[PDB]
Design a protein around this ligand. Structure first.
Ligand code: HEA
Ligand code: HEA
Ligand code: DMU
Ligand code: DMU
Ligand code: DMU
Ligand code: DMU
Ligand code: DMU
Ligand code: DMU
Ligand code: TRD
Ligand code: TRD
Ligand code: TRD
Ligand code: TRD
Ligand code: TRD
Ligand code: TRD
Ligand code: HTH
Ligand code: CA
Ligand code: CL
Ligand code: CU
Ligand code: CU
Ligand code: CU1
Ligand code: MG
Ligand code: OH
Lengths: 256, 535
C-alpha cells in the first residue's frame, strides 16, 4: 500500500486528501486564505504607503481630521460582508462534517495511556495499537536498529517512526466508516488529517465521527489531546484497502 | 531599600509590576529557548531520563548539552512540565502584570488627573499576592509531581481527568499559584474601577478620558467577571484531587467537559484582558508620532467595549472537537466572527490616524506599526480557527500556536515594548539611546517572525501541540523556528542591556514633554519623573 496520509519534508500545505470531507476543508481553507491574505496585504500596503507619503520630511504640517463618514461606513460594512460570505460557504461544510450518516463499517476506538484500543462491534474483533518503538514493542520511544527493523517488518521504513503502530485500523475503500470515540482514563484525541477528522476521546462520553476514504493506502494520525508522559508516542494508523482485502483481514481474525 | 516594596503609591507599585513582569518574562523566555533547543531537530537529545540520576544542579547543566539518541531515553514529563511552566508564567505572571499592574497602575491615575488611587493599601497587597503566586508557580516545578518526577505536566489550562490524577502535590501548588494571581488581579480591578469612577479631575468627564485609561477601565470589568469563574473551576479541581468530590470524574457521575466550559468562560476573556491595555498604548503612541489626534475617539472607546462584551459569549470556540453539538458549534462560530468587526474598526482607525500626519519613525512608533501588521496576521488566523469545519484540522496543532504567538508575542508584547520606550524617560528621568531601540526592534521583528510564521506550515502538515518529539518530515520548519527563537532571545538580552544602560547612564531627561505637543495627556504636563505627590 502507498503511504499517503503523512507529513512530507518541508511541507507548507495540508496533508493529501483521501476523503470528501478533507477535500471540503482544503477548499474552504484555500478560499479563506485568499481573503485573509488580501486583507493582510491591503493593511500592510496601507501602512507602508502612509509611512512613505506622510513621513515628517515629506509632510511637514499634519492634518487634524478625526472623521470620514463614508470611509467609516465602508470599513464597517465590508468586513461584515466578507464574514457573511465566509459563513455562507463554511456552515454547509460544517453540517456535512457533523451529520453522521448511516454506517457501512462501525469501529469503536478507546484512548488509553498510551495506546489505542479498537473494537469492530459487527465483527466481534478487538485489538490494541501501540507505537512501533513503544515499551509494548520492546522500545523506549526512540529510534534504534531494533525499531528500524520492526518498522521494516511491518511494511514501513525509518521515516514512519512516531507514526506507525504495530497493528492498524483496517477499513474498505469507498465505504462509510463511523468511528465511536471514547477515553478510558484521561482525555485523548483521535484524528487522521487525510480524512479531515478529529474527535476528543473523553472518559464517560461516546462521540462519533465519520469518513469515507476515496483511495487505498496508509494514513497516519497522532494523539491530539495532551494526556501525560507519552502523549507524543501513541499514534494512529489506518489502512484503507479493497473490499476483498478487508474481508480477508476480517477472516484472519475469525476464531473457529 | 525595602521602602520600595512597602510603598503604596501607584507609581512605585506600577514600577514594581513592570520590573517583576520583566524578570518573570526572562525566566519564561529562557524556558522557550530550552524548548526550541529540543524542537530544533527530530529525536530527543536534551530531555533525557539519564539526567535524573544526577543531582538538581548537575542534572540541570547536563541537560543543556545534546546527547546522541542512543544515550538519551526520552523524558516526556520534562517537556510537559516546561511548556506548562512557560504558559502559566506568561498568562498569569508576565504580560497582564506588566500591562495592567505596571503601566495601568503608573499611568491610568495620571491620565485621569487623580492624585491618588482609591485603595493604595489594597494596591500594595495586590502586588504581594502576585509575587506569592509567582513563587508558588515556580515552587511547583521543584515539587513531587507527575510520573514520580518533579513538576506538573498538564498544560496551562489544567484539563481533568489528567490534572486531577497527576500524582504528587505539584499540581495543588500550581492551583494555589493561580488563586493568588486571580486575587491580585481582582484587587487591582476593584482599585482601577473605583479610582476611574470617583477620582477623575474637575473637568475630566467621561468623553475626555484618554484611550489608555479607558482600555484599563474596560479590562478591569472583564477581570471581575472572568477571574471569579476561574477560581471556581480550579477549586473544583482542588476538591476532586483532595476532598473526594467527583465534579469531573465519570465514575462518580461527573463530566470532564464541564470543566472546559467553566475554564474557557474565563479563558477567552483572559486574552482580551491581555490585549486591551496594548490597544490603549498603541493609541497614545500612534497619535504622538503621527503628530495627529486619534481618529474616531468615540468609536475607539465603543469598539473596546464591544470587544470586551463579545469576549464573554465565544468561549466554546476552544471546544469544537470536545463533543459540542452542531448547534452549539454553529453559534460559537458566528459569535466569534463578529469580534473581527470592532477590531477592524480599531485597526483602520490607527491607519487613518497616520493618514495625513507628520510621521516620526522613533522606536515607540516602530513597535506600534509592527503591532498593526503582526496583530493583523494573528487576528486573521484567529478568524480561520473560528471556522469549526477548518478547526477540525487545526485544533491542537501548531497552527493554533502560530495564531496565539502572533497576537500575544508579536502583538501584546509589541505593545509592552512600545510603552517602555514611550514612557521610560517619564518614569526614570533618563532617556534610552535611539539607535539601540531601533536595533532591538529590528532583531525582535525578524526573530519573532522567523520563530512563528513557520509554525503555520507545521500545523498545516498536522504537527500536534505539546510534543517532545516529532516525525522526521517536520524537521525543516522546526529548525527555522528554533533559529528564530535564538535570535529573538539575543534581542531580548540586548533589550535588557538597553534598559540597564538607560537606567544607569542614559541621557538626562530635562523636559516634562520630551516628545512633541501631540503627546497631549496629563503625564506630559508633569516633570520627568513626576513628583511623589501629583496634581
Ligand atoms: C492576545 C491574546 C489573543 C487574542 C487577542 C486573540 C484573538 C482572537 N482569537 Fe485567539 N487564542 C489565544 C490568544 C488570543 N487570541 C490563545 C492563547 C489561544 C490558545 C489557548 C490554548 O489552547 O492554549 C487562542 C486560540 C484560539 C482559538 C481556538 C483554536 C483551537 O484551539 O483549535 C480560536 C477559535 O476561534 C481563536 C480565535 C480568535 C479570534 C477570532 C480572535 C479575534 O479577537 C481577532 C480579530 C482580529 C482580526 C480579525 C484582525 C484585525 C481585523 C481586521 C484587519 C478587519 C478585517 C478582517 C476580517 C474581516 C477577518 N483563538
Ligand atoms: C504572552 C504570552 C506568550 C509569549 C510572549 C510567549 C513566548 C514564546 N513562546 Fe509561547 N506559549 C504561550 C504563551 C506565550 N509564549 C502559551 C500560553 C503556550 C501554551 C502552553 C501549553 O500548551 O499549555 C505556549 C506554548 C509555546 C510553544 C508550544 C509548546 C508545545 O506545544 O509543546 C512554543 C513552541 O516553540 C512556544 C515558544 C515560544 C517562544 C520561542 C517564545 C519567545 O521566546 C518569543 C520571543 C519573545 C521575546 C524574546 C520577548 C518576550 C517579552 C516578554 C515576555 C515581555 C516581558 C515583560 C517586560 C519586558 C515588562 N510557546
Ligand atoms: C479601509 C481602509 C482605510 C484606511 C484608512 C486610511 C485612509 C484615510 C483617508 C482619509 O481621507 C481624508 O479624510 C479627510 C476627513 O474626512 C478629508 O478632509 C476633508 O474634510 C476635513 C474635515 O473638516 C477638512 O479639513 C478637509 O479640508 C477636507 O479635505 C480628506 O479630503 C480625505 O482625503
Ligand atoms: O441554517 C442551516 O444551514 C445548514 C447548512 O447550509 C443547513 O443544512 C443543509 O445543508 C447541509 C450541507 O449542504 C446538509 O449537510 C444538511 O443535510 C442540510 O440540512 C440547515 O438545514 C440549515 O438549518
Ligand atoms: C483476585 C486477585 C486480587 C487482585 C488484586 C490486585 C489489584 C491490583 C491493583 C491495580 O492497580 C494498579 O497499580 C499499579 C501500580 O501502581 C498501576 O501501574 C502503574 O504504576 C506502575 C509503577 O508502580 C507503572 O509501572 C505502570 O506502568 C502504571 O500503569 C496500574 O496501572 C494499576 O492498575
Ligand atoms: C484475576 C486478576 C487479574 C490479574 C491482574 C493483571 C496483572 C497484569 C496487569 C498489567 O498492567 C499493565 O501494566 C503495564 C506495564 O506497566 C501498563 O502499561 C503502561 O506503562 C507502560 C510503561 O510505562 C506504557 O508504555 C504504557 O503505554 C502504559 O499503559 C498497563 O497500563 C497496565 O494495564
Ligand atoms: C524590564 C522592565 C523594564 C522596566 C522599565 C521601567 C523603568 C522605570 C524605572 C523608574 O524608577 C524611578 O527612578 C527614579 C530615580 O531615577 C525614582 O525617583 C522614581 O521614584 C522611580 O520610580
Ligand atoms: C543566544 C541564543 C542561545 C541559544 C542556544 C542555542 C544552542 C544550539 C544547540 C545546537 O546543538 C545541536 O543540537 C542538535 C540536536 O538538536 C545536534 O544534532 C547538533 O549536532 C548540535 O550542534
Ligand atoms: C502549498 C502551500 C500552501 C501555502 C501555505 C501558507 C499558509 C500561511 C498561513 C498564514 C497566513 C496569515 C495571513
Ligand atoms: C449565513 C452566514 C452567517 C455569517 C455570520 C457571520 C457574522 C459576522 C458579522
Ligand atoms: C532540568 C532541565 C531544566 C533546564 C532549564 C532551562 C532553562
Ligand atoms: C552534537 C555535537 C555538537 C556539540 C554542540 C553543542 C551545542 C550546545 C550549546 C548549548 C548552549 C547552552 C545555552
Ligand atoms: C517560503 C516562505 C518562507 C517563510 C519564512 C518565515 C518568514
Ligand atoms: C546547528 C546549530 C545552530 C546553532 C545556532 C546558534 C545561534
Ligand atoms: C470475512 C469473514 C467474516 C467472518 C465473520 O463471521 C466475523 O467477522 C464475525 O465474527
Ligand atoms: Ca530534538
Ligand atoms: Cl496611590
Ligand atoms: Cu495525547
Ligand atoms: Cu478564545
Ligand atoms: Cu493520548
Ligand atoms: Mg484539544
Ligand atoms: O482565546
Amino acid at each position: 500500500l502507498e503511504i499517503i496520509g503523512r507529513p512530507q519534508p518541508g511541507g507548507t500545505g495540508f496533508q493529501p486528501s483521501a476523503s470528501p470531507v478533507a477535500t471540503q476543508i482544503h477548499w474552504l481553507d484555500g478560499f479563506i486564505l485568499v481573503i485573509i491574505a488580501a486583507i493582510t496585504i491591503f493593511v500592510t500596503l496601507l501602512i507602508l504607503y502612509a509611512v512613505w507619503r506622510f513621513h515628517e520630511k515629506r509632510n511637514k504640517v499634519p492634518a487634524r481630521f478625526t472623521h470620514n463618514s463614508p470611509l467609516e461606513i465602508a470599513w464597517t460594512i465590508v468586513p461584515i460582508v466578507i464574514l457573511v460570505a465566509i459563513g455562507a460557504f463554511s456552515l454547509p461544510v460544517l453540517f456535512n462534517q457533523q451529520e453522521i450518516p448511516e454506517a457501512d463499517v462501525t469501529v469503536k476506538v478507546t484512548g488509553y495511556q498510551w495506546y489505542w484500543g479498537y473494537e469492530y462491534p459487527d465483527e466481534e474483533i478487538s485489538f490494541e495499537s501501540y507505537m512501533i518503538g513503544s515499551p509494548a514493542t520492546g522500545g523506549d520511544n526512540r529510534m534504534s536498529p531494533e525499531v528500524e527493523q520492526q518498522l521494516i517488518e511491518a511494511g514501513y521504513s525509518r521515516d514512519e517512526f512516531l507514526l506507525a503502530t504495530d497493528t492498524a485500523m483496517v477499513v474498505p475503500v469507498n465505504k462509510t466508516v463511523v468511528v465511536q470515540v471514547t477515553g478510558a482514563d484521561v482525555i485523548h484525541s483521535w484524528t487522521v488529517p487525510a480524512f479531515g477528522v478529529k474527535q476528543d476521546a473523553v472518559p464517560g462520553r461516546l462521540a462519533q465521527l465519520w469518513f469515507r476514504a476515496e483511495r487505498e493506502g496508509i494514513f497516519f494520525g497522532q494523539c491530539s489531546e495532551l494526556c501525560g508522559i507519552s502523549h507524543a508516542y501513541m499514534p494512529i494508523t489506518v489502512k484503507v484497502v479493497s473490499e476483498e482485502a478487508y474481508a480477508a483481514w476480517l477472516e484472519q481474525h475469525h476464531h473457529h | 531599600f525595602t521602602r520600595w516594596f512597602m510603598s503604596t503609591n501607584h507609581k512605585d507599585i506600577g514600577v514594581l509590576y513592570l520590573f517583576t513582569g520583566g524578570l518573570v518574562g526572562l525566566i519564561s523566555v529562557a524556558f522557550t529557548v530550552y524548548m526550541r533547543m529540543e524542537l530544533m531537530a527530530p529525536g530527543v537529545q536534551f530531555m533525557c531520563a539519564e539526567h535524573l540520576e544526577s543531582g538538581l544542579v548537575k542534572g540541570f547543566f547536563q541537560s543543556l548539552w545534546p546527547s546522541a539518541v542512543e544515550n538519551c531515553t526520552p523524558n516526556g514529563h520534562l517537556w510537559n512540565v516546561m511548556i506548562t511552566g512557560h504558559g502559566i508564567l506568561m498568562m498569569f505572571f508576565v504580560v497582564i502584570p506588566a500591562l495592567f499592574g505596571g503601566f495601568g497602575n503608573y499611568f491610568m491615575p495620571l491620565h485621569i488627573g487623580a492624585p491618588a488611587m482609591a485603595f493604595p493599601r489594597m494596591n500594595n497587597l495586590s502586588y504581594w499576592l502576585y509575587v506569592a503566586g509567582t513563587s508558588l508557580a515556580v515552587a511547583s516545578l521543584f515539587a513531587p509531581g507527575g510520573n514520580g518526577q518533579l513538576g506538573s505536566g498538564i498544560g496551562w489550562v489544567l484539563y481533568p481527568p489528567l490534572s486531577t490524577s497527576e500524582s504528587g502535590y505539584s499540581t495543588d501548588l500550581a492551583i494555589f499559584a493561580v488563586h493568588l494571581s486571580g486575587a491580585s488581579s481582582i484587587l487591582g480591578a476593584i482599585n482601577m474601577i473605583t479610582t476611574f469612577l470617583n477620582m477623575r479631575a474637575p473637568g475630566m468627564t467621561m468623553h475626555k478620558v484618554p484611550l489608555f485609561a479607558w482600555s484599563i477601565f474596560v479590562t478591569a470589568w472583564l477581570i471581575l467577571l472572568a477571574l471569579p469563574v476561574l477560581a471556581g473551576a480550579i477549586t473544583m479541581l482542588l476538591t476532586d484531587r483532595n476532598f473526594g468530590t467527583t465534579f469531573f470524574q465519570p465514575s462518580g457521575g461527573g463530566d470532564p467537559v464541564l470543566y472546559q466550559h467553566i475554564l474557557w468562560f474565563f479563558g477567552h476573556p483572559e486574552v482580551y484582558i491581555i490585549v486591551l491595555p496594548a490597544f490603549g498604548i498603541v493609541s497614545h503612541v500612534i497619535a504622538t508620532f503621527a503628530k495627529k489626534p486619534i481618529f474616531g475617539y468615540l468609536p475607539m472607546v465603543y469598539a473596546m467595549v464591544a470587544i470586551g462584551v463579545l469576549g464573554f459569549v465565544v468561549w466554546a470556540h476552544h471546544m469544537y472537537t470536545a463533543g459540542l453539538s452542531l448547534t452549539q458549534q454553529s453559534y460559537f462560530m458566528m459569535a466569534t466572527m463578529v469580534i473581527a468587526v470592532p477590531t477592524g474598526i480599531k485597526i483602520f482607525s490607527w491607519i487613518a490616524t497616520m493618514w495625513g500626519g507628520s510621521i516620526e519613525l522613533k522606536t515607540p512608533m516602530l513597535w506600534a506599526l509592527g503591532f498593526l501588521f503582526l496583530f493583523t496576521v494573528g487576528g486573521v488566523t484567529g478568524i480561520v480557527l473560528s471556522q469549526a469545519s477548518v478547526d477540525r484540522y487545526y485544533h491542537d496543532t501548531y497552527y493554533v500556536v502560530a495564531h496565539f504567538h502572533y497576537v500575544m508575542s508579536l502583538g501584546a508584547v509589541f505593545g509592552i515594548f512600545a510603552g517602555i520606550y514611550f514612557w521610560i524617560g517619564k518614569m526614570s528621568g533618563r532617556q534610552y539611546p535611539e539607535w539601540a531601540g531601533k536595533l532591538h526592534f529590528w532583531m525582535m521583528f525578524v526573530g519573532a517572525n522567523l520563530t512563528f510564521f513557520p509554525q503555520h506550515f507545521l500545523g498545516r502538515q498536522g504537527m500536534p501541540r505539546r510534543y517532545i518529539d516529532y516525525p522526521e518530515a517536520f524537521a525543516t520548519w522546526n529548525f527555522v523556528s528554533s533559529l528564530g527563537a535564538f535570535l529573538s532571545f539575543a534581542s531580548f538580552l540586548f533589550f535588557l542591556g538597553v534598559i540597564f544602560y538607560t537606567l544607569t547612564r542614559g541621557a538626562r531627561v530635562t523636559a516634562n514633554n520630551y516628545w512633541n505637543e501631540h503627546a497631549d495627556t496629563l503625564e506630559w504636563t508633569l516633570t520627568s519623573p513626576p513628583p511623589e505627590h501629583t496634581f
